[PDB]
Amino acid sequence: MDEADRRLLRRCRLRLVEELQVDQLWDALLSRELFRPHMIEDIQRAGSGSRRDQARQLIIDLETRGSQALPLFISCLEDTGQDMLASFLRTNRQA
Amino acid sequence: MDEADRRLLRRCRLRLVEELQVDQLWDALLSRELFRPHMIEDIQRAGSGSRRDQARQLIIDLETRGSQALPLFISCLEDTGQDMLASFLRTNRQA
Amino acid sequence: MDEADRRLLRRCRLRLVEELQVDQLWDALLSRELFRPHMIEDIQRAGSGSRRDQARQLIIDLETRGSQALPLFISCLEDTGQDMLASFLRTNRQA
Amino acid sequence: MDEADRRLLRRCRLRLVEELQVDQLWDALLSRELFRPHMIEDIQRAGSGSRRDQARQLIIDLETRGSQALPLFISCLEDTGQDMLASFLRTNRQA
Amino acid sequence: MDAKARNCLLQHREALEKDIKTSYIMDHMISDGFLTISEEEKVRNEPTQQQRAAMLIKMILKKDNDSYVSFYNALLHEGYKDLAALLHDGIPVVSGITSYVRTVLCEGGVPQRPVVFVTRKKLVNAIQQK
Amino acid sequence: MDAKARNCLLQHREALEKDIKTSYIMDHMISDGFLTISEEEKVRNEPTQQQRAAMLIKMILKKDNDSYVSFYNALLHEGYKDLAALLHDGIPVVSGITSYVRTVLCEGGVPQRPVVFVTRKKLVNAIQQKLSKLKGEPGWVTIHGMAGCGKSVLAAEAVRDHSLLEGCFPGGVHWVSVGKQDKSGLLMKLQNLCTRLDQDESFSQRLPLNIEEAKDRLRILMLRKHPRSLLILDDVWDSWVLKAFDSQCQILLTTRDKSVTDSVMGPKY
Amino acid sequence: LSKLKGEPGWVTIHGMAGCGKSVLAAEAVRDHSLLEGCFPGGVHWVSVGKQDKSGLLMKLQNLCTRLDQDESFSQRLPLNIEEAKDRLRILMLRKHPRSLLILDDVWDSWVLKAFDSQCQILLTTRDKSVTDSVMGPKY
Amino acid sequence: VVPVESSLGKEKGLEILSLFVNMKKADLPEQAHSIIKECKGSPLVVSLIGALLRDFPNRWEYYLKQLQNKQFKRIRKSSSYDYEALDEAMSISVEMLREDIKDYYTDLSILQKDVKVPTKVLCILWDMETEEVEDILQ
């Protein structure tokens, strides 16, 4: 992941952890080979296991999953009906 | 544990941690006095606490539990319906 | 929170966790800005999630919420019909 | 609890968790002061809250409740009409 | 705490560590005013029941007579009959040259005073003042 | 501990170091009263399981018969069947000349009593009394006698009893042949002595060049390393020879003179 | 040699000049039963021969060097006979419990003095006197 | 600064000798009172007499006279203290002076014990201005 994408993920930290729905997201992430299944189990157990803690670990770990991790992640957002969040992200990448 | 058994456990590392079911295994291990109860609690908490992390610590710690730890461990596999895994192990010991 | 208020919360530990009704208390706590909403979700999930476990975490976390956390907390007790508990608390503060 | 009684509880793990009826057992346990009421609420919430999970936590926690916890526990079994289970236990203690 | 009490704790420490469920003891002790929240948080932070008990006892060994009693009472009150019995005989009563001297001053710091000396108080006091 | 036990540990040390998970052993040993918290902290400070085991064994090799048994029992109790089996034949008997006697007193502390000796009880008893007046402090006990009289030997059998040695001096016992000497020689005996005292090289390996620093390290060690342990001088001729050895320790010296207790402070007999 | 059961102790064989002797000792300690039971510490051997103070000192450093293979002590060379003797006793007691130390061809008394601390010795020689200066049981 | 320059009183002297010869005051010989008076408070000299009388339980007259004739050479002992006899200590303190002054000191021997002198007489002795003297004396 390039520095600009990483920086984007940090800038949107608050919004991501506040709004990301994870339970519905795992299938999408798998489909696009963003994470291996055990990686997902680890993220699921991050911290207290709340939605927020999972979300946070997801987006941190996301930075390590490749050059195209960010656009692929936006797509998974789209695929799971999180258009608003995906929209917030995209309009930054472009910005 | 002799060097050949230890070596076997290392060679089968990937398969063991991929396939070992642990939640059902503890009773068996106890019955054959392979581990003390606190040892089990420690293994349960290894790493992230996922099945894989528990499994890994189990098989590492197994190397320290005696001359007959490996055959006794195969038996516990058998006793808990993990015949496929036990079978993979045995056919190596013999091989 | 001053040491005297903290000490009061510890002295009344048993009574608080035995008698505190929490389900009805959250609105009050919010109204007086004693806790943020996520803080409340965390307290709700404390331990086993029983009334007692929630209550315990509430009163522990209460110690960190400000100089006036204790009197504000008594008021919320009053507001939710827990006069007996509020009364037990007040007669100590004064004592 | 002496080591022999503890060992007995471990040896009978499978049978206890398979057959123990708990809902009817709490009154008996209280009568003989084996557990405090909050301890019971905690055991009730153990794991998934199923009969088996409650049973398991009961018998684990039982090991900590005194020198006479095991015989007192057999009696409570008797008192609640779990003679078969109590019988399985006693014939071991003696054995 | 008194050496009797402390040695009683030390003697039975292993039994105590094996059985104590700290969540039923720390509450009483906090209520009684002889255990602090930060000590309790340090205890809570240990991952297993026996590790928590071990930490709590570590803390208690350093406390006063009242604290030992607080501990004992909570044990009794929470049905730990056998454990309290172990601690019963160790319950403490509640409510010049010494150890220090030969302890610190044997570091070479002082030659031993002679076999025979009269005591001159008047001057020693002055030196102590200055 | 007995040489049988210690050699059994040494023989099987590598097996023991490879397998022992110290957290399951140190607890028992602490409960039993044969391992200290500070030893346990020193063990805990090693980063790996085998390094911890190695440290623990290092410590145990220096301990007594009871300790070996404590160790063995904990091993057995914690399911280390094979390891206990290795240590079984090396178990020492636990609980006049006895085990203690040849255990502690083979440290060079005593020359063996001759092939043929009559027993003089009357004097030995006296020495035991005077020496027992201490209860511990710094202190001095002197026996001077006729030239050529039975003396040195007599002292050597003074510290023979089990009851005395165990109770009053469970720090160990040391012995130093001094004899007629000069400054150089005396200095030598000093380096040799301080070298003898620390077997774990807890201090650096270096040789102090003045009498003073020698004296210093002596005091530091004796106080810290070997608490309540009797240091015996043999055949002490001159005062300034005695000056050096003096720091805050218990001494039983044999000689021909009563004067040389001259320059030392503290109680005398 | 079996009278010992272990203690410090001394066993001497002296004989006619040129008689079969050294070899005879070398086959004394050949048996399995004896070696295993009575001496499971190991067995050591030292050629002494006619020597002076310097040489003797040398044999000492070499010996103590030979004893510890794990360098459990520091690497340094003791410069007096005394400290040599010391480290010998410490090692033999601690490191090698119940193990027989054999001397070969021992000529003089003061040569023997040094090697003496609290250990078992089987020495071969031509003389019966040099067991002179050592304390303890003799044969 | 705390001056210790003072010296002991009768009582303490008596107790020291007491503990040395193992008695109670009434059991002491009469000469005990006299000898201490000549001892003049220095814990040293007391420690000496109390050391020697330990060995030779009756020399009492011998020391009572020998301490009178004022010669301290006759008294010798070894102990924790660094020097044998009183004379030595003084002898050490004297030597550390400068080569210049060492003569000026000797002159001062003319004084009688207990005779306070004004400054002027010394000016007369060394033949120089007041303050100039007063400094050396200081």
Ligand SMILES: Nc1ncnc2c1ncn2[C@H]1C[C@H](O)[C@@H](COP(=O)(O)OP(=O)(O)OP(=O)(O)O)O1
């Ligand atoms: N209990 C004893 N029984 C038989 N002989 C004894 C006994 N004690 C001493 N001797 C005899 C034999 C010993 O070889 C010899 C040693 O005496 P010893 O006490 O060593 O003199 P010493 O060495 O103490 O005086 P010094 O040190 O001045 O030479 O004396």
Ligand SMILES: Nc1ncnc2c1ncn2[C@H]1C[C@H](O)[C@@H](COP(=O)(O)OP(=O)(O)OP(=O)(O)O)O1
């Ligand atoms: N069992 C033996 N069989 C045949 N020849 C022997 C035997 N023992 C000794 N010899 C003969 C051959 C050997 O080369 C020679 C060695 O004898 P040996 O015992 O070494 O004398 P020695 O070395 O002990 O006396 P010393 O030490 O005084 O020279 O003697």
